[PDB]
């Protein structure tokens, strides 16, 4: 345990929040790479219990208190009010960096799942690139698996315990409000996402021996973690995943019962002025949408997953520190 | 004719070659494209004589002549040396752009062969995500024709001409150089090389009466085409295809003459350093591989062939602008 560093390539002139904080948080990126090499060193890993992941999700919770300011925010019963300009939004990757003293272990394996036993395990001084994208249900933009789709979770007989799904290829998703001024949707291709599920279905499949695998909308909550919340632009995008996360994986095969038209489906999203915050517990009351075409083409790189001789599997997250062990999971702090 | 431009999802915080030049070379992309179909138009197309190809070449092989930089670049009897660092590869699609003034034709007929006319024609900004994958006898992450494989030839019956064979179904194939230090090899699924190689023996058995259509290894000349050649990770592969191109189409069906293991067919690949070059003619020598695993898991989406009782094809290409028709085949600059 430490207090690590954050390293950025960002740019002081880049008027896009992230730079702005990260110009004046982290530090310029380090070109020295030794990565040092190794085997014969068996080591454990938690990908939830990691700190990394705290530290991580405290300072871009300061990114965002400082970046993203509400007109209005309320907590406790408390609003403060602030000044609330539109700006300029685009994450950027950040590289976590360990102190002197300390290094950082990285898991090798590229079937690795989060918790237990790896040792193909080398060692460097900084974490790779990871974009602090803030969403539900979905992971955008983050690292692929190095092939085979990877099941995570601290435990998957716990029905209470969130399911992180690491994909392998990459499934876009182009979200749109264009030029009802929150009235917005999003386009998947259903083929791609069809065969997502199909492989995400036989791989849990495997560690539940075969019975009537469905795929689900949200059961309830609020409407952050029911649908497909995220950020573009600086705008609030709630996005429906009910023609998504629906279908059944029978008898080796995947068949999708959600709608669509012409091999794409399209969710309808709304932008929302009232936010909750995932900061903390409360809640931001935000100006207007932006006037123009919103527009975010981004990565579908993983899954928010939670369970309820049929298992049912919904789309979950809300906490976020989950979207950060989605990239951390690899990594651990050591002496 | 006009002097297009590039554009591309380029991350300049990224040190992987191709972004480095894109982003200095190339501009932004349009996150939400809009194309503009036409009915009552008949038009002409010749995807072997079209400019894009050329200007994309040129741009190739800059990109090429920036990043990937030998020890020594050989030229008869003048020799030229110079720092060959090792470097990020791996292609990011490149979209063609005309200029104000200047507008993109595409034929949107999805058995069009790129040569004569075509119908229904659609005008639009800049050209679909090509990666420019340099290779030889097989194209490697092309995007795969809209269904029923399409044979292309500027002549058929012309023997001395290339032949472009689009597939519509992507066959994988896994070369990998394990943790000799140059000797690699290649893994194909030969039940999916069956399959296709029957579907492609089909589809040229239409052009060609009816005759014992032969898949045979390449006639000879340097290892860059009598060889399935390409890049990995920096890596020039050279990997062996006699047990690849074999087999015969009669009356109907397919059969595998080379061999395989357990259902697999396995390329035998060595890296080299002594390459040739495809840009000019001359050669470069590089430095000794990298270490570690080097593998490149692809999907090949077409095939580049030459025609010789019996008409026999071989694997051609070594020229790369084929394999820059093989994408550009549906556009033309108009003004
Ligand atoms: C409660 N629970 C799990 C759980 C469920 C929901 C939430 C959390 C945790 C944390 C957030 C609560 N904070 C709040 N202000 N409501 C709340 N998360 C969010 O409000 C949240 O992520 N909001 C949000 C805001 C903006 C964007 Cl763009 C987005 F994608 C999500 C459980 N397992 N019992
Ligand atoms: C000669 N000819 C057709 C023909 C045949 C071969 C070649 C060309 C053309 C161009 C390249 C010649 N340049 C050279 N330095 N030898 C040469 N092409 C190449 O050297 C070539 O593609 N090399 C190459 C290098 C790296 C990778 Cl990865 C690869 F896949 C191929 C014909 N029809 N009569
Ligand atoms: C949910 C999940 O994948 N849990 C796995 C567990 O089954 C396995 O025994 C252990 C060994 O590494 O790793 C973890
Ligand atoms: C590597 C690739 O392109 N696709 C893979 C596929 O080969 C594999 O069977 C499946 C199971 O995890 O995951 C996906
Ligand atoms: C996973 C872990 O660390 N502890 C337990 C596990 O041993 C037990 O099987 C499970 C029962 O649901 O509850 C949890
Ligand atoms: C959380 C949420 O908005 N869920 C909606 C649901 O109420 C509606 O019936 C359905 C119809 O498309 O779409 C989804
Ligand atoms: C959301 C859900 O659980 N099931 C839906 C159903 O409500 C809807 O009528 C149908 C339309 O195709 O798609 C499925
Ligand atoms: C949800 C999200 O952050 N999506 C981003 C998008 O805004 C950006 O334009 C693109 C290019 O880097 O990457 C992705
Ligand atoms: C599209 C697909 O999945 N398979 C097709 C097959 O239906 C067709 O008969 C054949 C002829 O070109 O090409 C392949
Ligand atoms: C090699 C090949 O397919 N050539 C064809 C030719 O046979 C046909 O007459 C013409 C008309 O579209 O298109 C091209
Ligand atoms: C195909 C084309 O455009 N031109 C000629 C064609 O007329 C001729 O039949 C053929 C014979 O080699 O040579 C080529
Ligand atoms: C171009 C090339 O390397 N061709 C070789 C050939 O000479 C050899 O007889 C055969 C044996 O596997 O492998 C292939
Ligand atoms: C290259 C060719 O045309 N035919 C080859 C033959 O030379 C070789 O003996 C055989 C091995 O099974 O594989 C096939
Ligand atoms: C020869 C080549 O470019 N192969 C690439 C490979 O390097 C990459 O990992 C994969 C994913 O984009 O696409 C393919």
Redesign the pocket.
């Given at each position: 345990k430490t207090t690590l560093f954050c390293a950025s390539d960002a740019k002081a002139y880049e008027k896009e929040v992230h730079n702005v904080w990260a110009t004046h948080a982290c530090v310029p990126t380090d070109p020295n790479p030794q990565e040092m090499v190794l085997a014969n060193v068996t080591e454990n890993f938690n990908m939830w219990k990691n700190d990394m992941v705290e530290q991580m999700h405290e300072d871009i919770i300061s990114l965002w208190d400082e970046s993203l300011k509400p007109c209005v925010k309320l907590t406790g019963g408390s609003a403060i009010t602030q000044a609330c300009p539109k700006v300029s939004f685009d994450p950027i990757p950040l590289h976590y960096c360990a102190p002197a003293g300390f290094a950082i272990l990285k898991c090798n394996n590229k079937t690795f799942?989060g918790?237990?036993?790896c040792r193909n395990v080398s060692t460097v001084q900084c974490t790779h690139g990871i974009k602090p994208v803030v969403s539900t249900q979905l992971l955008l933009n983050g690292s692929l698996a190095e092939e085979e789709i990877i099941?995570?979770?601290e435990?998957?007989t716990n029905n209470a315990k969130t399911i992180i799904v690491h994909l392998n290829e990459s499934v876009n998703i182009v979200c749109t409000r264009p030029n009802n001024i929150r009235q917005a949707h999003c386009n998947i291709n259903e083929s791609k996402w069809n065969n997502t599920l199909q492989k995400v279905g036989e791989e849990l499949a495997k560690?539940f021996p075969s019975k009537t695998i469905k795929f689900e909308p949200s059961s309830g909550g609020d409407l952050e973690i029911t649908t497909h919340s995220f950020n573009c632009r600086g705008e609030f995008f709630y996005c429906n995943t009910s023609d998504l996360f629906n279908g059944t994986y029978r008898n080796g095969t995947y068949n999708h019962t959600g709608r669509s038209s012409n091999g794409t489906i399209t969710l309808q999203c709304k932008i929302k002025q009232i936010i909750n915050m995932w900061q903390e517990v409360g809640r931001a009351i935000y100006a207007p949408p932006i006037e123009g075409e919103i527009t975010c083409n981004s990565n579908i790189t993983g899954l928010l997953l939670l369970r309820d001789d049929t298992e049912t599997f919904r789309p979950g997250g809300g906490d976020m520190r989950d979207n950060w062990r989605s990239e951390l999971y690899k990594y651990k702090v050591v002496e």
């Open positions: 799942n918790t237990g036993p099941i995570r979770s435990n998957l560690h």
